[PDB]
Amino acid sequence: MKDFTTYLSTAPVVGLGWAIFTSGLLIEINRFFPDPLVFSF
Amino acid sequence: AHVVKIYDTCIGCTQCVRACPLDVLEMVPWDGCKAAQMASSPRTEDCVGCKRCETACPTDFLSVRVYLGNESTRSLGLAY
Amino acid sequence: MIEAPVAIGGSTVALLGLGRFVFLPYQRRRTDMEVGPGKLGPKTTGDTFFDRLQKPASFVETKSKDPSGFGIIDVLGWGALGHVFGYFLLACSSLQDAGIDAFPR
Amino acid sequence: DVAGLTPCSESKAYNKLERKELKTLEKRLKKYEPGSAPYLALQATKERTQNRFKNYAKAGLLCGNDGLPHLISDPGLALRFNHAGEVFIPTFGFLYVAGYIGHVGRQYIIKSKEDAKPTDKEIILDVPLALQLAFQGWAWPLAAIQELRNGSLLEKDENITVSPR
Amino acid sequence: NFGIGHRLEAILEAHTPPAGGLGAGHKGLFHTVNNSLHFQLGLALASVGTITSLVAQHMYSLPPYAYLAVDFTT
Amino acid sequence: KKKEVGPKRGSLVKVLRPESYWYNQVGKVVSVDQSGIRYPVVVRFENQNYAGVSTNNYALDEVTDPPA
Amino acid sequence: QRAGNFAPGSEPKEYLNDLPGNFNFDPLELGKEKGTLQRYREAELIHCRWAMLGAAGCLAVEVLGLGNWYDAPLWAVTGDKPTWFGIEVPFDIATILGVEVVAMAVAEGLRNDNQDMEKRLYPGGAFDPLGFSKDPKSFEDKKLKELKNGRLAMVACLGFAGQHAATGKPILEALGDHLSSPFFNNFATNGVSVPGV
Amino acid sequence: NMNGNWLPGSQTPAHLKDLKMAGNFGFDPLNLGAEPEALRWYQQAELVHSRTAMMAVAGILIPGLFTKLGALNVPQWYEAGKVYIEGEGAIPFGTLLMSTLFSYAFVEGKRWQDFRNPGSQAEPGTFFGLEGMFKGTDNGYPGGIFDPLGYSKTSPEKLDELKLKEIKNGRLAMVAFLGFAGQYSATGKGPIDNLADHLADPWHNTFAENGVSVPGLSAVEQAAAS
Numbered sequence: 001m002k003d004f005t006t007y008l009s010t011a012p013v014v015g016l017g018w019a020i021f022t023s024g025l026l027i028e029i030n031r032f033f034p035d036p037l038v039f040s041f
Numbered sequence: 042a043h044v045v046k047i048y049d050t051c052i053g054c055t056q057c058v059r060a061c062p063l064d065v066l067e068m069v070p071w072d073g074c075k076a077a078q079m080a081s082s083p084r085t086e087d088c089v090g091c092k093r094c095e096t097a098c099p100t101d102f103l104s105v106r107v108y109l110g111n112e113s114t115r116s117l118g119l120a121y
Numbered sequence: 122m123i124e125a126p127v128a129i130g131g132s133t134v135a136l137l138g139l140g141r142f143v144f145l146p147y148q149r150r151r152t153d154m155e156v157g158p159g160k161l162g163p164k165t166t167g168d169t170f171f172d173r174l175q176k177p178a179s180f181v182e183t184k185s186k187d188p189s190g191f192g193i194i195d196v197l198g199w200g201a202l203g204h205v206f207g208y209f210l211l212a213c214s215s216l217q218d219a220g221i222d223a224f225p226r
Numbered sequence: 227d228v229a230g231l232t233p234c235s236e237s238k239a240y241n242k243l244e245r246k247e248l249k250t251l252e253k254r255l256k257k258y259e260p261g262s263a264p265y266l267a268l269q270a271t272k273e274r275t276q277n278r279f280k281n282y283a284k285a286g287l288l289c290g291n292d293g294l295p296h297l298i299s300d301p302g303l304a305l306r307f308n309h310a311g312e313v314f315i316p317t318f319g320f321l322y323v324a325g326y327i328g329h330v331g332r333q334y335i336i337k338s339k340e341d342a343k344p345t346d347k348e349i350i351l352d353v354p355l356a357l358q359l360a361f362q363g364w365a366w367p368l369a370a371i372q373e374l375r376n377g378s379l380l381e382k383d384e385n386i387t388v389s390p391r
Numbered sequence: 392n393f394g395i396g397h398r399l400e401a402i403l404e405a406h407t408p409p410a411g412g413l414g415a416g417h418k419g420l421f422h423t424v425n426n427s428l429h430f431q432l433g434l435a436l437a438s439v440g441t442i443t444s445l446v447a448q449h450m451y452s453l454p455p456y457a458y459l460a461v462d463f464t465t
Numbered sequence: 466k467k468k469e470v471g472p473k474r475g476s477l478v479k480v481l482r483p484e485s486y487w488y489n490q491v492g493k494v495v496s497v498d499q500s501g502i503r504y505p506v507v508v509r510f511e512n513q514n515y516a517g518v519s520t521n522n523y524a525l526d527e528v529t530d531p532p533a
Numbered sequence: 534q535r536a537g538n539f540a541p542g543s544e545p546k547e548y549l550n551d552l553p554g555n556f557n558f559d560p561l562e563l564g565k566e567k568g569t570l571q572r573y574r575e576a577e578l579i580h581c582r583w584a585m586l587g588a589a590g591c592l593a594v595e596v597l598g599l600g601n602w603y604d605a606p607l608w609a610v611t612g613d614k615p616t617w618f619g620i621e622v623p624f625d626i627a628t629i630l631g632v633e634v635v636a637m638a639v640a641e642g643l644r645n646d647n648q649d650m651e652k653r654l655y656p657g658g659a660f661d662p663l664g665f666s667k668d669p670k671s672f673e674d675k676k677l678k679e680l681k682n683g684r685l686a687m688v689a690c691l692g693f694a695g696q697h698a699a700t701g702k703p704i705l706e707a708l709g710d711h712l713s714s715p716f717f718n719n720f721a722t723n724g725v726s727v728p729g730v
Numbered sequence: 731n732m733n734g735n736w737l738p739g740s741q742t743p744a745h746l747k748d749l750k751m752a753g754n755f756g757f758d759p760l761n762l763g764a765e766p767e768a769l770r771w772y773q774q775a776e777l778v779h780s781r782t783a784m785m786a787v788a789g790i791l792i793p794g795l796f797t798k799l800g801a802l803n804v805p806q807w808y809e810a811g812k813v814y815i816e817g818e819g820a821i822p823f824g825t826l827l828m829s830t831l832f833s834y835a836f837v838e839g840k841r842w843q844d845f846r847n848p849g850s851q852a853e854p855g856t857f858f859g860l861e862g863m864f865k866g867t868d869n870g871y872p873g874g875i876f877d878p879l880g881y882s883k884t885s886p887e888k889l890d891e892l893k894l895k896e897i898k899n900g901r902l903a904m905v906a907f908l909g910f911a912g913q914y915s916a917t918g919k920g921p922i923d924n925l926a927d928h929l930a931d932p933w934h935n936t937f938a939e940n941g942v943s944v945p946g947l948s949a950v951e952q953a954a955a956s
């Protein structure tokens with residue numbers, strides 16, 4: 001497990017996790033707020 | 042021909058001579074290093090400038106230096 | 122309009138008086154650290170024709186018969202400045218009498 | 227009405243662009259039966275287009291001679307004409323997030339350089355430490371200016387590698 | 392060679408800001424410019440390039456020659 | 466010879482050689498030659514150079530204590 | 534020897550210790566060099582005297598009801614005749630600019646050729662006819678008073694310039710507006726000095 | 731020691747564990763107060779923001795409570811400036827803004843000067859002979875005419891208790907004013923009106939019932955009610 005945990009601790013795995021998290025956050029924001037351009041409320 | 046210059050920072054590790062593909066360098070006795078060896082270039086007219094001696098130098102910066110210029114038949118590596 | 126002789130003559134006389142009696146004490150002290158002997162001073166030895174052509178001639182610094190150091194080179198420079206100022210005043214007056222107002226209203 | 231730009235609500239070409247987009251959406255919509263998934267998708271697209279065109283209006287947006295909205299750039303001019311949220315506030319938010327990222331990376335670099343073999347920590351991330359620094363960077367500008375004040379933000383030039391002249 | 396004028400080296404020596412803002416200032420630059428032809432070459436080419444860019448940016452907006460604005464290809 | 470020619474072995478030193486890769490950098494003293502060679506101070510660095518090496522020889526005048 | 538402090542508790546300046554009119558100041562550490570400090574001292578003194586002259590002119594042109602200082606040289610624009618208290622002196626702009634240029638040229642050339650730092654600061658002699666500068670204590674007190682009134686004159690000249698730029702009202706009408714309607718007429722009610730009020 | 735723990739079972743930061751500080755609860759998860767001078771600046775900032783908070787919250791609540799009872803007829807806080815600008819004898823907005831901003835500039839310059847050098851406002855012959863009482867006692871507690879009734883001239887334990895009470899009501903006032911702004915932006919009514927709505931109908935009137943506070947909750951409610 002700790003060998004597997006250090007494998008997930010490697011740079012490409014945490015990079016993939018960050019990319020998935022950021023892409024999902026931005027996609028859900030754009031879906032639930034369709035076409036945001038002007039900062040108004 | 043090219044110019045091969047060797048400074049006092051050489052440690053006499055003989056790596057530049059082994060990496061030389063045309064037998065330009067040599068080792069002479071010396072007192073400025075622990076190994077009591079110093080690189081020399083008595084056959085600099087046969088050097089082509091391949092900089093293989095500089096690749097094998099372990100000291101920081103370079104204890105051996107190759108300067109190009111005035112290419113000849115032997116310096117251009119021509120078999121014709 | 123302003124007549125040309127009175128304006129030009131007054132401008133050049135005032136500029137020459139400022140050169141001789143006013144700016145001359147300030148002169149030869151701005152050239153003290155400019156072409157002085159303590160610094161590089163002369164710029165050419167004067168060996169060949171071009172080198173001695175770089176060398177100053179014996180006409181601008183031979184003597185100063187004026188009580189001050191006002192040589193004829195300074196006379197020419199201050200007279201040129203006076204002619205410039207007089208022609209500037211004449212030009213401004215000429216633009217003024219033509220019915221054109223260049224000043225901000 | 228600044229920079230010779232009409233507001234989107236009072237504009238003319240903005241309405242032409244809106245009608246053109248609604249017209250091509252309706253032309254695509256008429257090719258499907260009302261009780262179909264492509265019909266619902268095209269209706270949702272038309273609703274999103276109408277909502278976007280309505281929300282771009284009544285927000286101070288300006289467009290000039292083409293109906294395409296323009297963004298007022300200069301602060302002060304944007305502040306006094308209700309255009310601060312166009313670019314003045316988005317760069318403030320971006321500066322906050324970028325400073326968050328930079329401060330978190332700086333903290334990770336400094337805390338990872340202490341132990342033996344820091345390159346291993348660089349290439350094999352300490353995930354609990356990275357997540358702890360991730361949730362501790364909400365006050366990045368205060369910490370950054372305080373390290374600037376105490377001098378730990380900057381390194382002396384005597385200790386920095388310098389290329390030969 | 393006359394008794395009046397300005398020495399370039401003296402102007403370069405004098406224009407050193409106080410309180411060590413520019414260190415030694417512009418001192419020693421006269422011999423640097425005069426001895427090095429490449430310094431003058433770079434300065435001349437930079438100024439002439441800036442002037443050429445100015446010519447390009449000002450000829451089209453301010454046509455100095457008659458019937459030049461109508462000639463679009465020219 | 467009294468004391469030693471160079472610094473204490475294992476102590477941190479700062480390289481003042483401008484042409485060296487590790488100029489204004491801190492390294493560890495491995496050995497100092499007592500024979501009297503030109504560059505007796507052997508310094509090992511954590512960060513390797515472009516050639517991949519991490520040890521070098523320096524003279525007495527190009528090594529000082531690291532500032533704090 | 535210190536004349537006071539512009540902010541009680543600021544860090545003192547060692548070089549700004551024995552200078553006349555020492556109110557510490559200098560937050561930007563300007564003029565740390567002694568020669569630049571002396572140049573700043575003499576420049577501040579002559580700016581003080583010029584601001585004194587200008588403030589006196591602007592006040593005296595208005596307390597006598599002779600017009601604004603802004604429209605005072607307007608006779609040059611309109612081609613009218615110059616006036617001074619009503620004398621109606623017969624001079625033209627050609628015969629005014631030239632004489633002013635040459636007179637202040639000889640004046641500033643004689644001032645610049647002093648070659649004495651204290652005399653550049655305070656020449657005395659022919660410029661001190663009555664001469665209350667004989668006693669050093671009264672000399673120091675009058676130096677401090679001159680510096681204070683000169684700084685007040687500089688800020689007054691800046692105030693006159695800014696007030697006439699923001700509003701067309703003259704000096705005395707602006708003063709009467711500030712006393713008559715203090716909370717309703719000030720720099721914040723112009724709409725120009727403060728954008729958006 | 732410490733007054734209490736904001737989060738039991740959590741590791742107290744080292745700079746706040748042994749710190750004898752008034753109103754300390756170890757609430758520094760971001761470690762902002764690591765430096766002692768930075769801690770002093772943050773303490774002074776907290777004190778000024780707290781006094782801001784209670785002054786504003788009292789001025790919002792007590793006139794608001796009086797108008798709810800009907801004794802007073804002042805407006806609510808979000809339109810009082812608007813009606814006061816439109817008064818018949820109203821000073822212009824810019825004049826009041828810059829005048830009381832300049833007055834703030836005076837007191838805050840004095841505060842900055844006595845912070846960057848403690849006791850530096852007691853320089854003799856500076857403020858009309860009254861500058862001898864301008865010397866501050868501690869960080870953020872000047873004293874003198876700031877405490878003319880002498881309530882701080884007591885035992886040290888009573889002084890620490892008073893400081894703890896001051897900072898506790900101050901922090902409560904910060905969250906109260908933040909709530910005032912937030913639920914006026916959400917509901918659009920006064921704080922007393924919001925309290926009355928929560929008292930009359932607690933379930934129907936809350937932050938979660940409106941989509942402004944939590945977006946998308948109204949859609950979930952409509953889907954559940956469908």
Ligand code: CLA
Binds near residue numbers: 025029034036037323
């Ligand atoms: C670098 C230039 C640039 C810029 C300035 C923009 C900017 C924009 N584009 Mg463009 N775009 C770009 C490059 C760029 N894009 C590129 C290269 C492409 C091609 C891939 C696109 C393709 C593209 C499309 C197809 C669309 C956009 C859209 C947008 C808008 C997105 C706004 C948004 O999502 O809401 C604002 C979103 C946020 C503020 C995100 C929130 C993040 C903060 C930090 C909060 C974090 C969330 C949470 C609260 C954090 C706490 C919880 C957490 C701990 C988990 C905005 C106007 C969309 C739009 O509406 O256009 C007008 C759109 O339709 N763009």
Ligand code: CLA
Binds near residue numbers: 318325
């Ligand atoms: C959709 C929105 C969007 C996107 C995708 C980007 C994308 C990018 N921006 Mg941009 N930006 C945007 C909107 C956007 N921007 C807006 C709306 C503004 C305001 C008008 C800016 C202003 C801005 C600046 C000023 C800079 C960027 C930079 C960058 C690039 C690298 C950021 C970085 O290093 O990581 C995150 C940041 C770090 C890892 C290090 C922190 C460094 C930041 C910039 C400093 C922040 C604090 C600083 C003290 C504040 C003063 C900034 C200074 C310039 C005055 C990246 C391509 C940077 C760049 O390209 O550099 C080459 C850069 O300097 N952006």
Ligand code: CLA
Binds near residue numbers: 328331
């Ligand atoms: C978080 C670490 C970090 C920090 C604080 C900086 C800071 C800086 N860099 Mg550097 N940079 C970084 C990472 C970082 N960089 C990486 C990973 C790369 C390789 C892509 C570069 C490549 C780079 C170049 C080529 C240049 C800079 C420059 C700069 C300066 C301008 C500010 C800026 O945003 O530049 C913009 C920076 C970028 C666009 C790089 C962004 C790279 C990724 C997207 C960010 C990495 C974040 C990191 C993974 C977070 C780790 C957190 C940890 C918990 C895991 C500033 C000193 C410029 C300079 O010299 O200015 C004086 C410059 O020319 N940087």
Ligand SMILES: CC(/C=C/C=C(C)/C=C/[C@@]12O[C@]1(C)C[C@@H](O)CC2(C)C)=C\C=C\C=C(C)\C=C\C=C(C)\C=C\[C@@]12O[C@]1(C)C[C@@H](O)CC2(C)C
Binds near residue numbers: 590
């Ligand atoms: C304001 C001023 C000087 C201001 C200086 C400042 C802010 C200095 C700033 C700093 O200190 C700080 C803040 C902090 C430090 O770290 C840095 C420095 C840099 C040291 C001078 C005005 C100086 C003003 C002067 C000299 C005014 C002269 C006026 C004259 C001659 C008027 C004449 C006439 O008005 C009449 C009488 C009648 C009219 O009809 C005709 C005319 C001709 C218009």
Ligand SMILES: CC(/C=C/C=C(C)/C=C/[C@@]12O[C@]1(C)C[C@@H](O)CC2(C)C)=C\C=C\C=C(C)\C=C\C=C(C)\C=C\[C@@]12O[C@]1(C)C[C@@H](O)CC2(C)C
Binds near residue numbers: 806
């Ligand atoms: C001064 C103040 C408000 C003043 C308002 C005023 C005068 C308003 C004026 C008026 O209303 C009146 C009076 C009456 C009306 O008729 C007119 C108007 C014009 C409407 C608020 C301060 C308000 C201050 C607040 C809310 C501060 C909050 C700080 C927080 C939450 C800090 C938290 C943390 O820092 C910790 C503690 C530790 C870290 O590790 C983590 C984080 C999260 C960073």
Ligand SMILES: CC1=C(/C=C/C(C)=C/C=C/C(C)=C/C=C/C=C(C)/C=C/C=C(C)/C=C/C2=C(C)CCCC2(C)C)C(C)(C)CCC1
Binds near residue numbers: 431432433434441
């Ligand atoms: C590498 C090198 C070199 C080179 C360099 C170069 C090449 C440079 C360039 C440079 C450049 C290329 C620059 C430019 C500049 C510019 C400028 C500086 C400009 C200015 C302008 C102005 C100032 C203007 C103003 C105005 C006017 C007049 C009008 C309108 C308005 C205004 C105000 C805007 C050399 C050789 C020296 C040598 C050493 C090294």
Ligand SMILES: CC1=C(/C=C/C(C)=C/C=C/C(C)=C\C=C\C=C(C)/C=C/C=C(C)/C=C/C2=C(C)CCCC2(C)C)C(C)(C)CCC1
Binds near residue numbers: 134206
């Ligand atoms: C003899 C003598 C004398 C006398 C002298 C005199 C009297 C003089 C004068 C003089 C004058 C009285 C003048 C002069 C002048 C000079 C000069 C040198 C000039 C110049 C000029 C110029 C250069 C011009 C220019 C121009 C033109 C051409 C055109 C356009 C405009 C202008 C202006 C630019 C005496 C007795 C003392 C002594 C002895 C000797």
Ligand SMILES: CCCCCCCCCCCCO[C@H]1O[C@H](CO)[C@@H](O[C@H]2O[C@H](CO)[C@@H](O)[C@H](O)[C@H]2O)[C@H](O)[C@H]1O
Binds near residue numbers: 026281
């Ligand atoms: C990753 C994080 C994402 C954000 C948090 C999680 C999602 C929370 C819900 C987000 C959406 C809430 O919805 C809120 O915004 C919508 C944005 O179009 C708006 O939606 C409303 O108005 C739109 C037109 O403008 C209509 O097309 C919608 O049918 C209508 O519901 C409303 O203002 C509100 O319903």
Ligand code: SF4
Binds near residue numbers: 052100
């Ligand atoms: S490779 Fe370098 S150090 Fe080794 S013997 Fe040759 S010159 Fe000397």
